[PDB]
Design a protein around this ligand. Structure first.
Ligand code: EVF
Ligand code: EVF
Ligand code: ZN
Length: 259
């Protein structure tokens, strides 16, 4: 069974042994070289339609925590931008560091942010998520950088429930959470074709990475770092540095929605 992680013996540099696509042609994350990314006037504004989002549950899955949504019909969806069709929000999660100077998966001119939020959506033309991940245009992940400064008010409900899901396999009710409270002001973005950043590392993602980071407080991110990778009663391994480093860009272009 799966025994990959972010530890000293099963981290990203080992993943290729069980998931050979780890060395593939469209792996994520990547460094976004802002001077090489080209403005594409053909890109549209993103349409983030989360007014009818139905959050359900929050789960510590042993590598991050997922806030899960009802994706049994079109409620919270992502459209426009580089996308054709409609992508349904299934979950969001974060990647973060042991200290503020690392944690993001994507980097910007080699800068690492303290954390990165991933809002994961699947293309409804494929009927279910499991079918969508088998397709090159199956998923759209909206990535948002976190820097440490002022608190993010809309994040606080998330951080206050974390004490109740400290260890792997724990979950809690998490209804009526509004993910619009996690967005920055601007929806300017970069986009490129990539992959899932944890196993199975499938090359099924259109990445949309917002240029504007959100600000969270030191106290908020410190609470992320109190989570555990381990299960209940097991030796404590703090859930920190659950990020994959930048992968080779290979034959890919990163496009900018903005001049
Ligand atoms: N999936 S993996 O990163 O290749 C992996 N690494 C390790 C290390 C020790 C025991 C089992 C596994 S499975
Ligand atoms: N970190 S991510 O690319 O957004 C992502 N990776 C995976 C892997 C397995 C299942 C869901 C997701 S969502
Ligand atoms: Zn992620």
């Amino acid at each position: 069974a799966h025994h990959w992680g972010y530890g000293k013996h099963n981290g990203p540099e080992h993943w290729h042994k069980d998931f050979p696509i780890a060395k593939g042609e469209r792996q994520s994350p990547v460094d976004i070289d802002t001077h090489t990314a080209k403005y594409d006037p053909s890109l549209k504004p993103l349409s983030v339609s989360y007014d009818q989002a139905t959050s359900l549950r929050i789960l510590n899955n042993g590598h991050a925590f997922n806030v899960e949504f009802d994706d049994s019909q079109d409620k919270a969806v992502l459209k426009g931008g580089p996308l054709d069709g409609t992508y349904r929000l299934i979950q969001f999660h974060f990647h973060w560091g042991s200290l503020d100077g690392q944690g993001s998966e994507h980097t910007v001119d080699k800068k690492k942010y303290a954390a990165e939020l991933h809002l994961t959506h699947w293309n409804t033309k494929y009927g279910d998520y499991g079918k969508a991940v088998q397709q090159p245009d199956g998923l759209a992940v909206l990535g948002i950088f976190l820097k440490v400064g002022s608190a993010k008010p809309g994040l606080q409900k998330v951080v206050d429930v974390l004490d109740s899901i400290k260890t792997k396999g724990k979950s809690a009710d998490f209804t009526n959470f509004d993910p619009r409270g996690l967005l920055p002001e601007s929806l300017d973005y970069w986009t490129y074709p990539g992959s899932l950043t944890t196993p199975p590392l499938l090359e099924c993602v259109t990445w949309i990475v917002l240029k504007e980071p959100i600000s969270v407080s030191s106290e908020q991110v410190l609470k992320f770092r109190k989570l555990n990778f381990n299960g209940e009663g097991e030796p404590e391994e703090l859930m920190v540095d659950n990020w994959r480093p930048a992968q080779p860009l290979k034959n890919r272009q990163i496009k900018a929605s903005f001049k």
